[PDB]
Amino acid sequence: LIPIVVEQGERAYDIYSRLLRERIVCVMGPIDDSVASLVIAQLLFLQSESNKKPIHMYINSPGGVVTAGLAIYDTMQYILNPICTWCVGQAASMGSLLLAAGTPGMRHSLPNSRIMIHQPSAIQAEEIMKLKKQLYNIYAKHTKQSLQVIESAMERDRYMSPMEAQEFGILDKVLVHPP
Amino acid sequence: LIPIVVERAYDIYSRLLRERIVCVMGPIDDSVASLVIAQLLFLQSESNKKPIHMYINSPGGVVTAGLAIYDTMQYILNPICTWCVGQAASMGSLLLAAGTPGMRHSLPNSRIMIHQPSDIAIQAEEIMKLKKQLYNIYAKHTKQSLQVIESAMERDRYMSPMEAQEFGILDKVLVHPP
Amino acid sequence: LIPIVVEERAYDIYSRLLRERIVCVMGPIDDSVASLVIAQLLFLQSESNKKPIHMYINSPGGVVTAGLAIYDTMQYILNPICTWCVGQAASMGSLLLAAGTPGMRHSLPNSRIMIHQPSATDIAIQAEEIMKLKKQLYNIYAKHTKQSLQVIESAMERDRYMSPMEAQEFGILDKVLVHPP
Amino acid sequence: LIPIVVEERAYDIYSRLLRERIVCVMGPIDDSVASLVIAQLLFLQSESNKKPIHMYINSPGGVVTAGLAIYDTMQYILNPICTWCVGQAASMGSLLLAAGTPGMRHSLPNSRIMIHQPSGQATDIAIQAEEIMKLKKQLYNIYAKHTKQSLQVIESAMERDRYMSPMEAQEFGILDKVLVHP
Amino acid sequence: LIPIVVERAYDIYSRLLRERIVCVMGPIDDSVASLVIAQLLFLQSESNKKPIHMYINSPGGVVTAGLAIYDTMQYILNPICTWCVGQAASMGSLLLAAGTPGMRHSLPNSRIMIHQPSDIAIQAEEIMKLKKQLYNIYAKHTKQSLQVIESAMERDRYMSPMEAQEFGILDKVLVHP
Amino acid sequence: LIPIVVEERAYDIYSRLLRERIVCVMGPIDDSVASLVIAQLLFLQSESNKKPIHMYINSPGGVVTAGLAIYDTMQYILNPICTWCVGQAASMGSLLLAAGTPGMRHSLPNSRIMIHQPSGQATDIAIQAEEIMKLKKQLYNIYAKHTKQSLQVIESAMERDRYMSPMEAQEFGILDKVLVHP
Amino acid sequence: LIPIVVEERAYDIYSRLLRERIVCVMGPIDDSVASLVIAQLLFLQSESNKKPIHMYINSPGGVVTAGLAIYDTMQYILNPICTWCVGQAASMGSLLLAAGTPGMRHSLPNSRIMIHQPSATDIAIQAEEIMKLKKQLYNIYAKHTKQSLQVIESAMERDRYMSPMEAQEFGILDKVLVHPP
Amino acid sequence: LIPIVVERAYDIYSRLLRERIVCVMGPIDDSVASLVIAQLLFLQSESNKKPIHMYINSPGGVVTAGLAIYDTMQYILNPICTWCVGQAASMGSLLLAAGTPGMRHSLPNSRIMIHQPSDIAIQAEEIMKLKKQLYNIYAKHTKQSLQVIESAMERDRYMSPMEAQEFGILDKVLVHPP
Amino acid sequence: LIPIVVEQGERAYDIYSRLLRERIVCVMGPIDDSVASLVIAQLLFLQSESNKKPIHMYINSPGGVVTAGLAIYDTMQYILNPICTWCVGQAASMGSLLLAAGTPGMRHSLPNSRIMIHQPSAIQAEEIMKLKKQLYNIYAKHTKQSLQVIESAMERDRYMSPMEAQEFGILDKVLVHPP
């Protein structure tokens, strides 16, 4: 059960509602059209509190529906707030894409995270390759890698260390403690 | 369901949180990781110097989710007292040993096992990669050499709190509060 | 449905029991029941480390590791603990009952008490770990009943139950009582 | 949906019943039903150590030890206990029914009462043969106690697989009154 | 119950196979493929010039399972008469159009579809490889262009036996013999 | 229904295939599939210690140890083994495919071949991490053995999550011929 | 589908294996697999109490009591027994493999052999019965491998597998071979 | 499925029956009772003097069905050799002890338990009635006193073939044929 | 699996078909409309082999459908052959009725059997009491007890020993060995 915390005059929120107070948005678990709705709702709300106050996106996800992930991505690029993305636990498939789509220089990962841009395996065939050529362009955009490099990197069924993903362009800093 | 205590009224688990106590009950997954990390960061923003007591009674769980909780432990600046009740096995023993040195406790009749019992389908080198991270993290907080960790992590057996204290997993074995 | 009692304030009846320092160990024992009991044990202790807690037990048993944690917390906390057996107390339930403060372990007249372990852990475990559990149970039963290891070992082999009078004679119980004295 | 009434405060209809010192024993009796009923019994005793408690039984039976825990709590508390039988009180339902205070064990006209124990579950774990009859002789004693019938009469009656009318349940010692009106 | 027909006695389907008939019925998988191939190779052993008849009433199935049947049809030397009963969609019509030219028949009420309704989970490039193979096999046997194949194969509709003859899936539409 | 043919005797079509020294490896490879195939392999060897055996593979993979038992039996027997790939030979399917006798490892044109091991079940019991790679290096060795590729090349190729055409599978050392006709 | 081979007579391929005195211990081991193996062991013995029987093993394990019965029958019958490990031989499967006639226990090159018991009986059993099983396994492994109780006890704690060469060195196997010699 | 032996051809279980061998494999119910009794009466009509070998590897079963097989044993006039392999518990140990005296065998590593582990819903006195029949039958074939049976039938434990031979359940403990 | 036995020129039957050769009919397990069909088929067949050669009915049953049991009973009274009924294991509810409906003086039970004429507990109420008043009359017919005695005996949820059932009229002899 989700616990309750008390603020200070006095009011009490559940601890997850309290992270949204600190402009923290959690992207935990697999991604579908409901996670997309919840995340977009919180991303458009925190922009209403301030257009320039940064938002923090915690990503601990194995992937999910591609269109639902693109939906969260398109809302990320839309809003004006900078977004600090934090990779904790793992970020694979659609998860690493939201991770790599943070504001340049604010994409982080904790030391022991695992990062994967390879996509683990009904619509027609050409619509699936349409999706991948989009993911090829987004990953290239934010990593600053070429379409050649992104295509072959997504072929390798394997994970990256935080240091690997940083020197690939996925994230920017690998923190251990607050600076 | 949960009883209600009166101080304003919380339930007994929100009241536990008001005492800076974080429970790690049973199997560990991404939801347990999300809920524990949320309390961990909440407890630090209230005070980065007051310790955080973390109760562990778990048979293990998803390795990444456990590593997620481990890194949040290492991130936050508070002293952290880890407590082992009932058992702490697999990912549970790692969080148990990841407490602040000199503050890792266990109750007398509990059990501790670092043998990893055998979120998506994973290739062979990544399971070896994750097994290697557990090797490093265990050898670091137990001060044991790496060759001693891999051998011990392989005997499919449990340790008594006395045994686990000799190994360097925990520090005190308390029957009552001294 | 859990009813409401109004005292002013309005609790559900189980919350109101905690206002009288009563902790119910009902049904089988898993880690959820363990975590719930320990939460009320550590909470009631901070309300008063010397006011006695009352532990109603009506249980067939449960996970050994989840049960030993409850026992270890009972030995930890400073409060004296009155155990009460209604209905039954079998497997690990009797171990909690026998582990009350000496002289404060009770049972209602028509209860059934068994220390024989039927059939235990959240994970499948090796044969030597199953018996390490059993030898820990032997030590706890010998400690609180003041019986020998020879007697505890052969008593748990009897796939039978004990009357509240037999259990009092064996050492699990102190006072079988039918009315408030 | 459980209705909500208003007495100012507003409970549900069942919390409103408990405020009248009424404890329902509806349906099969298990461990959770036992601790639920027992909690109300000790609560209503703390509010008054001699004000009567009314206990509605419409039960087909259930776990014997769970019902024995309820029976032992009735025997524990000081209050007069007014047991009422509507619909039916079979198996352990009739044990609590007879376990009321002598004089105020009631029933409504069109109910049925059975002391024959149908072969809810019998025990909370599958038990040995000698344990099954240890309970049965415990039931034999508790029945013969509140009926003032001989153990030879309880044993034969519990063998016959049949219900009893409220008037039969009266002439046997199970209950005291068969009311139609107040 | 599969009935018996008669100095010997086979089940009715075993009787059909001595007439050199092969029934591709229902969905197509590796079991259907392994059963059809064992019959295609056996019948060629009896004679590599005697024709073989393939009754097809199929809604489709696994691509690699179907391509194995098609690959075996190309391997064996016998002329192959594909017959379309009820329906032939997805891999079923590709088997139908793979018969010997001039010997691909259809009953007058059948429905044919080359559009593919949307063993291991696989990448997006492997599905497109599959599609390019179904593109080239259709283009090979319907003497149509890859523009005409790719375009028509992505309209979600059925053809009539006369329509399928216009396109090049089959050659003949019999009403009686 | 499995058809019945007539050669006088009359088998089913699959027993008729076995009388042609043809052993099918259809679909996923498990323990029962292994002992079934191995039994045919040793049988066809006793009938003739040097007459070739034809082995049809249309398999997506399966239990590694089960396929390793089949691979070890091919290595055991004396006969030339003619492996054929129709449809696909993924995971351990391509291991047996490459495990044919050098020279007579064939494929049909429209097949696919994958050596990347998809993450049937991997092992017959859930095993430790070091055991999972002990199998993987065993696969690395067996692949590089029959392809005469370096272990560095096998490791990179098995990492890429993709199939290979028969012509790719030829230029890599997996098979020898890509037949369209006899 | 089990094919047919025609010899004249026509058997299914598994029946034809028995004509060559081959007994397949495939898959997990329950009492059905035990009763089937023992039937072919007692039958092949009456055909010739001295012609060797061949025991193909590819098993992850199974019921301990069902497995020990197969072992006891192997020790009973007069025939020498060649054991063969293909694929794997884990838990009780390796115990049958190690219990071949000394000098006639084989394994193909790519097999995996484990004596560590994972996680056993048709009924839930007490902790002392689980270890009595384990101490019987210790005696059988020490007997056939000629290793000591100290080594068998610590080897079964290693949750790992053995190569056919390690198992030959440990005492479970005699001859790893890749071709007919 | 069952292999086929050639002598005419049976399967290996009909071939076992041709050797006057009756299997009692696994749990005992009315179908196992019907099949075993059918072979028992069939074997007697072929010869009421040639012995009948009965293999027991069972965890118990329905008490009535086991009593059904017990009474058919006592009915037929043949000598009966009972064999315990793997285990013989609950109803299984009764049939094991119900063999012809001096001909009850067990293989070395098997287990034997008379503790009855705890066809329609049954009242309390009938379960006591059935428990009493097991008491009498055990005390009769083990020559043990009744008070010794009820105590032993209650320790939730197994006996080694040596133990069960001391108790009087079986007679010989053979490792090979002597 | 049902084993095979060989007769003697030579032919092989399954062991259950071989008991029908010896005019043995098994009534094992619960009774429904299929057991009734099988038993009536074998009872009418053995009468075709001989009108006077006795038939043997083995009964090891807990009960079953009342109408399906009456069906087996009505065929029993119809055929001319005497019927030796043997109670092995148990005979409760409809099972004890077929047991009690054998030829007078040929109803047996082995020593350790359990016998129950009490009926363990969709049609209208009056059709159920119609059924019981039939079972009251059949049990009275063959036991030679009165309707008073049968009604109260079926009230007691309990079993009878073979010696009890013999001295009640249910069976005639309790054998231990062949005479």
Ligand SMILES: Cn1c2c(c(=O)n(Cc3ccc(Cl)cc3)c1=O)CN(Cc1cccc(C#N)c1)CC2
């Ligand atoms: C009416 N409206 C609209 C937008 C907005 O941002 N706000 C301010 C707002 C929003 C939520 C809250 Cl809780 C408080 C204040 C507003 O009021 C933005 N929409 C465009 C848009 C852009 C990106 C993603 C989605 C989705 N899916 C939709 C247009 C309408």
Ligand SMILES: Cn1c2c(c(=O)n(Cc3ccc(Cl)cc3)c1=O)CN(Cc1cccc(C#N)c1)CC2
């Ligand atoms: C915005 N923000 C951020 C952090 C923080 O600690 N606090 C103070 C705070 C936190 C919770 C509450 Cl309820 C009240 C106050 C805050 O406000 C820490 N993040 C970094 C971080 C560190 C370790 C694990 C994860 C994960 N997964 C993320 C960065 C953002």
Ligand SMILES: Cn1c2c(c(=O)n(Cc3ccc(Cl)cc3)c1=O)CN(Cc1cccc(C#N)c1)CC2
């Ligand atoms: C921080 N802390 C700690 C303890 C305590 O008793 N209290 C007072 C308290 C507790 C709950 C509440 Cl609701 C209100 C006040 C506290 O505040 C006791 N812990 C050790 C311990 C002892 C026995 C069992 C377990 C478990 N599992 C853990 C150490 C930390």
Ligand SMILES: Cn1c2c(c(=O)n(Cc3ccc(Cl)cc3)c1=O)CN(Cc1cccc(C#N)c1)CC2
């Ligand atoms: C601490 N305590 C105790 C009792 C009591 O009656 N009251 C007053 C009370 C009770 C409930 C509430 Cl809601 C409010 C006030 C109290 O405060 C009675 N226990 C003995 C007992 C008797 C019968 C059944 C069980 C069970 N199972 C237990 C002993 C403890």
Ligand SMILES: Cn1c2c(c(=O)n(Cc3ccc(Cl)cc3)c1=O)CN(Cc1cccc(C#N)c1)CC2
């Ligand atoms: C040994 N052998 C072989 C073949 C053959 O056609 N015949 C004659 C034969 C076949 C079946 C039967 Cl029942 C009787 C006679 C033969 O004897 C053809 N194989 C290659 C092949 C070709 C097309 C598809 C697959 C598949 N999948 C496999 C090679 C071996």
Ligand SMILES: Cn1c2c(c(=O)n(Cc3ccc(Cl)cc3)c1=O)CN(Cc1cccc(C#N)c1)CC2
């Ligand atoms: C007794 N025996 C043995 C073998 C053999 O090949 N043959 C001839 C034979 C085989 C099957 C049939 Cl149907 C007819 C004749 C024989 O008779 C081969 N075994 C060694 C072996 C080799 C490869 C895999 C396994 C497995 N798993 C086992 C040894 C025994």
Ligand SMILES: Cn1c2c(c(=O)n(Cc3ccc(Cl)cc3)c1=O)CN(Cc1cccc(C#N)c1)CC2
């Ligand atoms: C009657 N009898 C008996 C035995 C025997 O070996 N044979 C020869 C025989 C067996 C099967 C077949 Cl198909 C053909 C001939 C025989 O005839 C061996 N039994 C003792 C025994 C030994 C080892 C395991 C078990 C088990 N479980 C049982 C005693 C009886």
Ligand SMILES: Cn1c2c(c(=O)n(Cc3ccc(Cl)cc3)c1=O)CN(Cc1cccc(C#N)c1)CC2
């Ligand atoms: C007709 N009849 C009868 C019996 C007999 O033994 N035989 C010879 C026979 C039996 C089976 C076969 Cl395959 C071949 C020949 C026979 O022919 C034995 N019954 C008495 C009985 C004894 C013990 C258990 C049950 C049961 N349940 C029944 C009486 C009838």
Ligand SMILES: Cn1c2c(c(=O)n(Cc3ccc(Cl)cc3)c1=O)CN(Cc1cccc(C#N)c1)CC2
């Ligand atoms: C045509 N017919 C009829 C009967 C008969 O007994 N037999 C001789 C026969 C029967 C079966 C076989 Cl295998 C061999 C020979 C015959 O031929 C008896 N039916 C009356 C009847 C009596 C009792 C129960 C049922 C039922 N349900 C039916 C009338 C018809």
